[PDB]
Ligand binder design. Structure first.
Ligand SMILES: *[C@@H]1O[C@H](CO)[C@@H](O[C@@H]2O[C@H](CO)[C@@H](O[C@@H]3O[C@H](CO)[C@@H](O)[C@H](O)[C@@H]3O)[C@H](O)[C@H]2NC(C)=O)[C@H](O)[C@H]1NC(C)=O
Ligand SMILES: *[C@@H]1O[C@H](CO)[C@@H](O[C@@H]2O[C@H](CO)[C@@H](O[C@@H]3O[C@H](CO)[C@@H](O)[C@H](O)[C@@H]3O)[C@H](O)[C@H]2NC(C)=O)[C@H](O)[C@H]1NC(C)=O
Ligand SMILES: *[C@@H]1O[C@H](CO)[C@@H](O[C@@H]2O[C@H](CO)[C@@H](O)[C@H](O)[C@H]2NC(C)=O)[C@H](O)[C@H]1NC(C)=O
Ligand SMILES: *[C@@H]1O[C@H](CO)[C@@H](O[C@@H]2O[C@H](CO)[C@@H](O)[C@H](O)[C@H]2NC(C)=O)[C@H](O)[C@H]1NC(C)=O
Ligand SMILES: *[C@@H]1O[C@H](CO)[C@@H](O)[C@H](O)[C@H]1NC(C)=O
Ligand SMILES: *[C@@H]1O[C@H](CO)[C@@H](O)[C@H](O)[C@H]1NC(C)=O
Ligand SMILES: *[C@@H]1O[C@H](CO)[C@@H](O)[C@H](O)[C@H]1NC(C)=O
Ligand SMILES: *[C@@H]1O[C@H](CO)[C@@H](O)[C@H](O)[C@H]1NC(C)=O
Ligand SMILES: *[C@@H]1O[C@H](CO)[C@@H](O)[C@H](O)[C@H]1NC(C)=O
Ligand SMILES: *[C@@H]1O[C@H](CO)[C@@H](O)[C@H](O)[C@H]1NC(C)=O
Ligand SMILES: *[C@@H]1O[C@H](CO)[C@@H](O)[C@H](O)[C@H]1NC(C)=O
Ligand SMILES: *[C@@H]1O[C@H](CO)[C@@H](O)[C@H](O)[C@H]1NC(C)=O
Ligand SMILES: *[C@@H]1O[C@H](CO)[C@@H](O)[C@H](O)[C@H]1NC(C)=O
Ligand SMILES: *[C@@H]1O[C@H](CO)[C@@H](O)[C@H](O)[C@H]1NC(C)=O
Ligand SMILES: *[C@@H]1O[C@H](CO)[C@@H](O)[C@H](O)[C@H]1NC(C)=O
Ligand SMILES: *[C@@H]1O[C@H](CO)[C@@H](O)[C@H](O)[C@H]1NC(C)=O
Ligand SMILES: *[C@@H]1O[C@H](CO)[C@@H](O)[C@H](O)[C@H]1NC(C)=O
Ligand SMILES: *[C@@H]1O[C@H](CO)[C@@H](O)[C@H](O)[C@H]1NC(C)=O
Ligand SMILES: *[C@H]1O[C@H](CO)[C@@H](O)[C@H](O)[C@@H]1O
Ligand SMILES: *[C@H]1O[C@H](CO)[C@@H](O)[C@H](O)[C@@H]1O
Ligand SMILES: *[C@H]1O[C@H](CO)[C@@H](O)[C@H](O)[C@@H]1O
Ligand SMILES: *[C@H]1O[C@H](CO)[C@@H](O)[C@H](O)[C@@H]1O
Ligand SMILES: *[C@H]1O[C@H](CO)[C@@H](O)[C@H](O)[C@@H]1O
Ligand SMILES: *[C@H]1O[C@H](CO)[C@@H](O)[C@H](O)[C@@H]1O
Ligand SMILES: *[C@H]1O[C@H](CO)[C@@H](O)[C@H](O)[C@@H]1O
Ligand SMILES: *[C@H]1O[C@H](CO)[C@@H](O)[C@H](O)[C@@H]1O
Ligand SMILES: *[C@H]1O[C@H](CO)[C@@H](O)[C@H](O)[C@@H]1O
Lengths: 532, 534
């Protein structure tokens, strides 16, 4: 059969009061509902919050949650748990505002195993949440603590723990550094990340400012100050300041940027004055790193949307708005010429990988992969290309036509008669080894595939990144309404929402003009739903 | 007389010579349905970066440009030359600078007047022009000098060229200017993401002064640096220095883009006021901006190449005898905008010489004005929309309806299009702005894929661009010129250059406002523009 395109009113109707102590029940069957990404059971989700791995290995994801509407507001912290970052268990709402005229904005969570806070005299797995409380006139930082492993939180009796008398002061990311707690918090409309320190998470002292770096956009948000291992040597690492900006991103709306540098417990110093954008498309925002991971592990997740159209995407009839990105493992590397680069790769996908749909070593060919049998409507693919040494040593031996095309094509079996009726691909990827646009990689969601997408004036159709080195590896995940691509071992990555009128039913992978002796290896797998 | 511009031209108008003409102006047919009528485009062939931009002592503006006279793609670079007194009415001139042989190219550079004969080239004239440009060879990029004594038409190479080599193949686009007591060159160490600053007493001996490295967006290369002094918009007695750098490829929208840095320059060092990156244009088709040398005091005048390296060599205009047009000429200022602070202002240079008949004037709020310009033979229009919100709405924006918006749509001609079936009526370009609601301050500029078979199929021809204001939109000015739309927001605070290649020519425009607060004043003015070629 075919995934429903709209759900019964009982699956999409939202409560008039926020459920306390109860898990919100969700129908995850909609034709747009991602099957291996997190999305809330009902309602509207945005930024990931309080991300941490507990001592039993369970990942806790919290998130900005409107349980009452399909648009942003009434923010609570939703909560889901996973042991593998793919199979999620919805949990009751973790943090509630004190009244209907306040909202629980973004923040972070840490384990306090040594009871620095004083909240945990008889436990070693105390969790402290540090979050922004939004009121009509102020944004302040507050603490709440959990003794049950991060399910139920109690507000700190002397909240707030930090106010500067500002209405633009939010998204505290807290972490342990040697002998004290560090908070990175956004003085959002001043384009400043403020660094504060604390011995106990409740009394905070100003250390330093990081101001007017990289792209300003209209606000700094969701700062993450994290230590990231080197891809080619995970014994080595550097600090990275990751800043989300919204609005005012170059593609429009929201985007993440980063700065490699040094951190010494009080001051972050960037290695240079350059601006670096994390993702070359527009649906990757508010990346948050999981606290309490071990040495050599950098784990993050982002909200896979854009503030310019997140509240207008056509999924509310399927009981949700917004999904998280694939969970990510991060590295730092140097790429040819450009130097510093934030590597993003999908966190181990093995737990959701299903049957092989195609395995091919054919070069200069077109492989058609039908996945109308894959009930998840989600696929993974990996394409490796190894050029002959002669082509690496002399690039003038590569034909101008040497290229790769990947197209995701609409289902004939589950086609909508109401949409475009187009045979337009839902999504395309094009790369040129040489010619006039040498190294250029285009990722597109053709307007002709989506009535909604064509009409939305911010739903940009085409994205590109230009490689210096030849493309040697490409990995992708398509999950009903999302495509993520990872180029050259995660050197470059892009997160793109797609809302085709007809569900994707097949994909074509074409290579052509590749030099004599070029090795091509393609693998495609159906993914297994984590919700069904 | 024709009723519709030709979409394809006779082979005589498009066929390119097999040898580069010397001493002769290349003849051009400027009638194609995509040929801009108030922007500069080469008579035939392929153009890119503006070069050697300067005003001579007679008040004549000289535009040079990267020129392939032999193909409709980049290569065989010479300097083309056109002159104007007003930066709208252009006169094509013979090719100004030629490579020494068939295996070298004249890459980008700048030109200056040397009235005091610092160079030694001009013992008997105060009208000497010196061009400083990159010579590209298979293995090297070096800086060379050439001088003109006839007012910038014919150049002679300096006998001891090159004037500057560092043994690099990525070393180009020198912009030279006078600072107090010496010449300054800003030149790109392109693949090192460094602008090198050299000084010279005479334009032929250059000394290294300082580096400006790894600032703003890196892209894949730094190109065409401009280090210029720009007056304050609200106070012409004040100014600051600006480092303007083009990057290609690797721009965030894909391909090529311009960025800038406000700062201080003292003759040897440029120091940015902060570590922020600032993008000049919020669309895709504005690159290699160059400032005119030797303007009057307090006039900052620039022009850019209105294209993108990802599709400039593939745009469907070669059948109309050209590839590439320059942007409108721009008057530049610096200002502070709400919250963001420093901002490069770009406004169209005085358009009065090309303004034709008024097509529409409206004071109506919450209405739709339909403007037919099928009778405007230039197929080019200017519009200005002013909006004055009531003070109550300025002081408290929660008083503005979520519906408060402006929509501008450019619609295909019924008079010059006989096309039928799906997509036939798609707008060629749209502009949408919201005062409030979920995307408050958001301005979208789009070129619908459905309007252009070529644009839909090109994988780099991005359909939608946006910029988000902090302040309400109070002014919007635009020029549509056959195949180009440029928009200027809030007195040139924000600007965008966007190419459009609709299957049918544009014949009409709709301007709609809705949901505007009670007592909002709106003024809309639209004029046909007069062709500068015809
Ligand atoms: C993947 O899709 C792209 C289109 O997005 C294909 O690229 C295009 O390929 C053709 C064939 O090489 C190009 O045509 C050629 O034009 C040049 C002149 O520019 C000519 O010298 C060649 O003989 C040929 O006729 C076309 O320009 C090009 N389009 C773009 C936008 O670059 C690509 O071939 C596809 N690759 C595969 C493996 O399917
Ligand atoms: C001012 O900036 C210029 C341009 O960045 C500097 O010259 C450049 O210096 C670097 C470092 O010495 C050179 O990079 C290196 O190149 C060699 C050759 O391929 C390579 O073996 C090394 O691994 C390294 O990447 C670069 O070639 C060179 N570029 C140019 C155009 O000369 C210059 O040193 C700076 N001067 C000062 C005083 O800061
Ligand atoms: C650190 O950064 C903050 C934020 O930019 C600075 O505080 C701001 O200071 C300016 C100038 O007085 C005020 O106009 C803003 O309203 C303040 N913003 C906030 C969030 O308070 C602070 O002065 C900086 N401190 C240091 C030591 O540089
Ligand atoms: C201009 O066009 C836009 C659509 O692009 C109109 O926007 C919609 O406005 C209503 C409120 O009036 C919202 O509820 C919709 O969500 C908006 N659409 C989008 C895509 O955001 C806008 O009203 C139009 N304005 C005028 C003056 O015609
Ligand atoms: C709601 O709580 C916030 C602090 O949490 C307080 O500032 C505000 O006054 C409260 N509002 C009402 C209506 O009680
Ligand atoms: C809790 O810790 C206190 C010290 O603060 C100690 O006296 C007591 O034995 C502990 N109680 C339990 C149940 O472990
Ligand atoms: C981890 O498991 C232990 C033993 O089963 C249990 O006591 C503890 O509560 C668990 N911790 C968390 C954070 O769930
Ligand atoms: C945290 O440390 C500060 C500074 O010593 C102290 O004043 C404050 O009381 C501490 N808070 C708690 C809850 O221990
Ligand atoms: C951190 O480094 C800064 C210089 O960037 C220095 O001023 C400060 O004292 C250092 N702090 C510590 C804790 O070493
Ligand atoms: C990248 O190269 C720089 C030298 O330019 C070096 O200092 C840094 O450690 C390198 N980083 C990685 C991740 O290899
Ligand atoms: C691919 O096709 C190119 C272009 O026709 C040809 O030169 C080459 O032999 C082919 N290479 C492979 C690996 O099949
Ligand atoms: C591509 O290469 C990577 C690393 O060498 C490997 O893990 C992967 O299985 C390869 N994929 C294919 C389709 O051969
Ligand atoms: C062309 O002129 C350049 C610059 O003088 C020189 O380097 C190059 O060798 C010349 N090429 C030939 C083929 O003469
Ligand atoms: C330019 O000035 C330098 C330094 O005084 C001098 O050596 C050089 O000969 C001059 N060049 C000419 C062409 O006069
Ligand atoms: C220009 O300023 C720099 C510092 O920014 C200084 O080192 C240099 O001496 C100055 N040069 C002149 C000519 O004043
Ligand atoms: C912008 O504001 C800064 C700080 O007040 C000031 O130094 C600068 O001169 C201003 N620039 C303009 C163009 O008004
Ligand atoms: C425009 O219409 C809105 C209702 O949509 C109304 O509130 C407003 O008063 C009108 N404004 C003007 C200037 O007529
Ligand atoms: C808008 O006002 C400006 C001056 O503020 C004026 O130059 C322009 O002609 C006006 N345009 C309209 C639409 O009234
Ligand atoms: C969801 O859209 C589908 C199109 O496949 C319809 O069949 C259904 O009625 C609902 O509108
Ligand atoms: C979504 O809307 C469709 C209308 O076709 C129904 O099929 C479904 O029950 C739900 O209301
Ligand atoms: C509300 O009712 C619908 C059917 O109309 C069910 O799908 C759902 O489980 C709930 O009972
Ligand atoms: C649940 O909510 C959805 C989205 O608003 C509706 O389409 C449905 O009928 C029910 O109200
Ligand atoms: C669930 O119930 C608790 C009980 O006090 C409320 O505080 C909460 O807002 C929600 O309604
Ligand atoms: C969570 O909400 C459910 C709704 O039925 C209750 O059963 C529970 O007591 C808690 O309020
Ligand atoms: C230019 O394009 C137009 C499209 O209608 C044709 O009429 C003409 O013959 C030429 O192809
Ligand atoms: C433009 O179209 C004409 C035919 O109308 C041709 O002569 C020319 O080669 C180009 O295709
Ligand atoms: C002149 O050039 C144009 C573009 O290639 C052709 O359409 C025409 O036939 C002639 O070759």
């Amino acid at each position: 059969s075919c995934a429903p395109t709209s759900l019964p009113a009982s699956a999409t109707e939202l409560p008039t009061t926020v459920p306390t102590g109860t898990v919100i029940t969700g129908d995850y069957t909609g034709s747009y509902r991602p099957q291996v990404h997190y999305s809330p059971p009902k309602g509207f989700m945005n930024d990931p919050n309080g991300c941490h791995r507990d001592r039993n290995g369970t990942y806790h994801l919290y998130y900005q949650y409107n349980p009452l509407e399909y648009v942003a507001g009434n923010q609570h912290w939703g909560h889901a748990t996973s042991d593998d970052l793919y199979h999620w268990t919805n949990q009751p709402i973790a943090i509630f505002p004190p009244n209907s005229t306040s909202q629980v904005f973004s923040g972070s969570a840490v384990l306090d195993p040594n009871n620095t806070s004083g909240f945990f005299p008889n436990t070693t797995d105390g969790v402290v949440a540090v979050y922004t409380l939004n009121t009509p006139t102020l944004q302040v930082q507050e603490v709440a603590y959990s003794t049950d492993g991060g399910y139920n939180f109690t507000p700190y009796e002397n909240n707030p723990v930090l106010s500067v008398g500002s209405n633009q002061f939010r998204d505290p990311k807290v972490f342990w550094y040697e002998d004290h707690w560090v908070m990175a918090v956004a003085a959002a409309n001043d384009f400043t990340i403020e660094i504060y320190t604390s011995p106990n998470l409740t009394s905070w002292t100003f250390a330093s400012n990081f101001t007017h770096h990289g792209l300003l956009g209209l606000a700094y948000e969701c700062p993450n100050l994290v230590q990231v291992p080197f891809q080619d040597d995970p014994s080595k690492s550097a600090w990275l300041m990751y800043i989300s900006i919204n609005p005012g991103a170059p593609l429009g709306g929201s985007v993440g940027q980063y700065f490699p540098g040094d951190f010494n417990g009080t001051h972050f110093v960037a290695y240079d004055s350059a601006a670096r954008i994390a993702d070359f498309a527009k649906d990757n925002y508010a990346s948050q790193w999981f606290a309490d991971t071990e040495n050599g592990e950098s784990i993050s997740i982002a909200w896979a949307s854009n503030w310019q159209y997140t509240q207008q995407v056509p999924t509310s009839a399927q009981a949700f708005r917004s999904a998280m990105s694939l969970p990510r493992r991060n590295y730092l590397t140097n790429i040819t010429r450009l130097g510093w680069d934030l590597v993003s790769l999908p966190y181990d996908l093995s737990p959701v990988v299903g049957p092989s749909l195609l395995s091919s070593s054919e070069a200069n060919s077109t492989a058609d992969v039908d996945f109308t049998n894959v009930t998840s409507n989600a696929v993974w693919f990996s394409l490796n290309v190894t050029l002959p040494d002669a082509a690496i040593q002399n690039a003038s031996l590569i034909s101008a036509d040497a290229s790769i095309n990947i197209t995701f094509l609409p289902s004939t079996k589950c086609s909508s008669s109401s949409g475009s009726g187009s045979d337009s691909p839902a999504a395309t990827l094009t790369y040129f080894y040489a010619g006039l646009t040498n190294g250029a990689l285009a990722l597109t969601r053709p307007a002709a595939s989506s009535s909604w997408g064509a009409e939305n004036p911010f739903f940009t159709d085409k994205f590109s990144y230009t490689l210096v080195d030849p493309l040697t590896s490409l990995v992708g995940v398509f999950d009903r309404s999302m495509l993520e691509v990872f180029v050259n071992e995660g050197a470059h990555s892009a997160t793109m929402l797609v809302f085709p009128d007809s569900p994707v039913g097949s994909m074509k992978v074409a290579t052509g003009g590749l030099p004599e002796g070029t090795q091509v290896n393609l693998q495609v797998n159906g993914l297994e739903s984590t919700w069904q």
